[PDB]
Design a protein around this ligand. Structure first.
Ligand code: 7M6
Ligand code: 7M6
Ligand code: KAI
Ligand code: KAI
Ligand code: CL
Lengths: 253, 249
């Protein structure tokens, strides 16, 4: 029986809707749960899903200490992390990621109706505020970047004691819907959001290329097996079916 | 430290013979995306390397008796330390070697001539006048062979009919077939991109029908695999892989 650490994030992992109190794995549904089910069926393991106690994904502080799901793996409090956990340089040095089960890139979430069409449109002005979820991989992309425009955007994002950043995606979404604000957001989440709320749209294409992967502790004997199962699921068209299932939403033009 | 043996294969624009007016020797024989990648990896990780073309000139597939060939076999048998090529990360291969995380993303798509009303794989699957195929024994052909999706099973039935006459031995052959005859080639999207920049009568039809990547191959248990994965992620986040692709495409 593996311990799986995860985090609430639509539509990957959500509280199931019911009139009775829920317990254990039955508390949850979503893309990641469907994934975990397929993975257990292929590999034959049992699993206990547990929300990550500090409710974080995994980032470093000044002193080099980790938190979130990444920390859970490092400390062996979980065997797998199944969540939209972005595969990044800094994380991959401290955990063993499976190969990606989903591809994505950073893009822009914004309200419909405007001439804005790219990141460059934002970086070369100051009237439109823009930011990212604080300490997420998207923020780290801008902070570590040495590319001109992205350097400029980070300067603005982090200025004024980081007032342009948000603590979570929902806050970002509300901020886009209410004020003159664009959120730098992972493309898969933009796709999800813009098919439920027809007032929102993606601006431009992907500014980078990356994946979500299943996290395991360094040296874990499951990583390679999960990689192999993921490849099987992709080649069978199942990853694609799973995403169609959970991204369908309400439908927007 | 021991000079690493790197198996690879000629394929534009990943690995090509360098154009010079005099004979070439060693690594100097070669240029291309994968040579640039290799050189970036060696600088980050600090290894020396000798590039060696795979003797049988194959990527790596199994025969009836389940025996492997090509670069994959080279790695399995420890005749090479690394494989640096457009070697698709697949289920069957990952079971027998270790791949780094992908340095490039791609999917199967369609190479065809411009000006036609064909718009998707479906369009091809439901007809028989337009011939279509893939490189024999490549990961693309294997995808269709193993698919249980209705459209793709129908396509596999077509491709394998008539003793696989719809298949080609290599991408160059496929490309000429598309240019000359009424033929569509199922081809990796990255290669389509390269071809259509250079052949203005050709285009991609429809989107990607799957999603995968090229990765550096190492023998199972190699200590270079994770190191190379981390180096790849670093190159990616610094935008050098993007630069490298633009350079060669
Ligand atoms: O073959 S993989 O390592 N795992 C399966 N997927 C499909 C889900 F993303 C992808 C996608 C993109 C790239 Cl570059 C690589 C891969
Ligand atoms: O983090 S990775 O495994 N290796 C780095 N890259 C960049 C190579 F394109 C990508 C791209 C797409 C996906 Cl899904 C996954 C990855
Ligand atoms: C939803 C959140 C905060 C996560 C999801 N993947 C990124 C990560 O794994 O860091 C974060 C998003 C982002 O940074 O745009
Ligand atoms: C060019 C060739 C024959 C290779 C390249 N990658 C795939 C592989 O690694 O199998 C093959 C192409 C394909 O099957 O469309
Ligand atoms: Cl990996």
């Amino acid at each position: 029986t593996l311990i799986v650490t995860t985090i609430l994030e639509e539509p990957y992992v959500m509280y199931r809707k019911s009139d009775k109190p829920l317990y254990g794995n039955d508390r949850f549904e979503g893309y990641c749960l469907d994934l975990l089910k397929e993975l257990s069926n292929i590999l034959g393991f049992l699993y206990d899903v547990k929300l990550v106690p500090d409710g974080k994904y995994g980032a470093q502080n000044d002193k080099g200490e980790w938190n979130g799901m990444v920390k859970e793996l490092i400390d062996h409090r979980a065997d797998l992390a199944v969540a939209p956990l972005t595969i990044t340089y800094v994380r991959e040095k401290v955990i063993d990621f499976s190969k990606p089960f989903m591809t994505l890139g950073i893009s822009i979430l914004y309200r419909k109706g405007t001439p804005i069409d790219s990141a460059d449109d934002l970086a070369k002005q100051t009237k439109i505020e823009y930011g990212a979820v604080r300490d997420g991989s998207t923020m780290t992309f801008f902070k570590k970047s040495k590319i001109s425009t992205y350097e400029k955007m980070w300067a603005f994002m982090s200025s004024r004691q980081q007032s342009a950043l948000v603590k979570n995606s929902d806050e970002g979404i509300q901020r886009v819907l209410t004020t003159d604000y664009a959120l730098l957001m992972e493309s898969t989440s933009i796709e999800y959001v813009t098919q439920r709320n027809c007032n929102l749209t993606q601006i431009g294409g992907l500014i980078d290329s990356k994946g979500y992967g299943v996290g395991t502790p360094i040296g874990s004997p499951y990583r390679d097996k999960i990689t192999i199962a993921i490849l099987q699921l992709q080649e069978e068209g199942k990853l694609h079916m799973m995403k169609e299932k959970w991204w369908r939403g309400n439908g927007c033009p």
